[PDB]
Amino acid sequence: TTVKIASDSSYAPFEFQNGQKKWVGIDVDIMQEVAKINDWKLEMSYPGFDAALQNLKAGQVDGIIAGMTITDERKETFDFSNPYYTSALTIATTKDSKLSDYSDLKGKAVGAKNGTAAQTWLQENQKKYGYTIKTYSDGVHMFAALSSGNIAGAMDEVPVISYAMKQGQDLAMNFPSISLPGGYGFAVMKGKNSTLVDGFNKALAEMKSNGDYDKILKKYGITATKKATPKKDVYTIASDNSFAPFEFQNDDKQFTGIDVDLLNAIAKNQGFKLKWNFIGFQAAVDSVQSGHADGMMSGMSITDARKQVFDYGSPYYSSNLTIATSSTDDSIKSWKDLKGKTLGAKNGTASFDYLNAHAKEYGYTVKTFTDATTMYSSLNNGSINALMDDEPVIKYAIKQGQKFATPIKPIPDGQYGFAVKKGSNPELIEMFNNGLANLRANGEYDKIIDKYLESD
């Protein structure tokens, strides 16, 4: 009635021998607590990963925990637990390196261990960035090459590097990381030993819930962050082709905006990779709905009707309607100051509808515009006294230099949200909510917003 689990023979920080020749690590500690939480007698063995798979298949072993990536190919043969760890790739450098971006590697030599994801990734992105790829047989040889200056960076797993820095090696992680899809899991033979998987999953949740998980990671130099687990290599994001300031093209004709900058920033923080398609709001809707785009970021209002077919992340922008006046007009300082004035609004908008519904109230006149430019030209030349529009459009127009002012407190009009097709791509909603939370705390969020809407 022993639970026999096999693992790799040397893989720090997941399983390895310390100064006592004692077996220790993240996998080791996690498996041992799971056993205790389940009142299991644990019998670990360390033959090595390939041998572990062979022993599992022969039934000589009950299960495996050895930094095993969960993959659909492997689900043909194994059953996995939930991911217990989500690793990532990045570039390690000596502490005194000034390189911080993958562009910096142009002309440089980069190392990776032979036969690894790090190797593959380097190849897939070599044409882009223009580096040389040196490959190595093990980490010892790779890092000796980093230390001696013969490569300028070395690509490996964040956990492996984080641990080496904890030990006291001359190493740094200045680059972004790339999450590895799938995550690591505990595995049993397919259709067998289900109660082990369920016992692993239930225990794992407790350890996440009671802080014992984070303490184990802290032990090996890893500061547990909220990170979703990617399932694909890259996710496609559709969006509108021109809705400044959220998605639009600047004069170099490259796309930019709050939506672009924020979502890219969210993904960088989570280690996901995104591909944008600025096809148009309705085109984005249909593409997500038809299963040809993974999600959309396109200044989209969150509504109950859309909730019938989309899933939304946490709200990321409070969409407001506000009045624009001439920045030299001292006569409009409140709604009550609008009596005798004519105000412009675009046809068929909420601005339009709101102005109409209060026009009799406050004694102003509403001029309908069909072209946004002719509206703003009319405020500029004084043919109208004021306009109403979405708050961020007016602020961006002001930051771009239009001589406008907003004297009156705005009108709330819903919230923008990131969307996926309902029930699709749940890890993408996760990565949006996690990343958004983090960028709100360090201030990247406000920094992106002020980039487009803060003036003087």
UniProtKB/TrEMBL annotation:
<keyword id="KW-1133">Transmembrane helix</keyword>
<keyword id="KW-0472">Membrane</keyword>
<keyword id="KW-1003">Cell membrane</keyword>
<protein>
    <submittedName>
        <fullName>Glutamine ABC transporter permease and substrate binding protein protein</fullName>
    </submittedName>
</protein>
<feature type="binding site">
    <location>
        <position position="350"/>
    </location>
    <ligand>
        <name>L-glutamine</name>
    </ligand>
</feature>
<feature type="binding site">
    <location>
        <position position="301"/>
    </location>
    <ligand>
        <name>L-glutamine</name>
    </ligand>
</feature>
<keyword id="KW-0812">Transmembrane</keyword>
<feature type="binding site">
    <location>
        <position position="299"/>
    </location>
    <ligand>
        <name>L-glutamine</name>
    </ligand>
</feature>
<feature type="binding site">
    <location>
        <position position="298"/>
    </location>
    <ligand>
        <name>L-glutamine</name>
    </ligand>
</feature>
<feature type="binding site">
    <location>
        <position position="306"/>
    </location>
    <ligand>
        <name>L-glutamine</name>
    </ligand>
</feature>
<feature type="binding site">
    <location>
        <position position="390"/>
    </location>
    <ligand>
        <name>L-glutamine</name>
    </ligand>
</feature>
<keyword id="KW-0653">Protein transport</keyword>
<dbReference type="GO" id="GO:0043190">
    <property type="term" value="C:ATP-binding cassette (ABC) transporter complex"/>
</dbReference>
<keyword id="KW-0571">Peptide transport</keyword>
<feature type="binding site">
    <location>
        <position position="240"/>
    </location>
    <ligand>
        <name>L-glutamine</name>
    </ligand>
</feature>
<dbReference type="GO" id="GO:0015833">
    <property type="term" value="P:peptide transport"/>
</dbReference>
<comment type="similarity">
    <text>Belongs to the binding-protein-dependent transport system permease family.</text>
</comment>
<comment type="similarity">
    <text>Belongs to the bacterial solute-binding protein 3 family.</text>
</comment>
<dbReference type="GO" id="GO:0015276">
    <property type="term" value="F:ligand-gated monoatomic ion channel activity"/>
</dbReference>
<keyword id="KW-0732">Signal</keyword>
<keyword id="KW-0813">Transport</keyword>
<dbReference type="GO" id="GO:0015031">
    <property type="term" value="P:protein transport"/>
</dbReference>
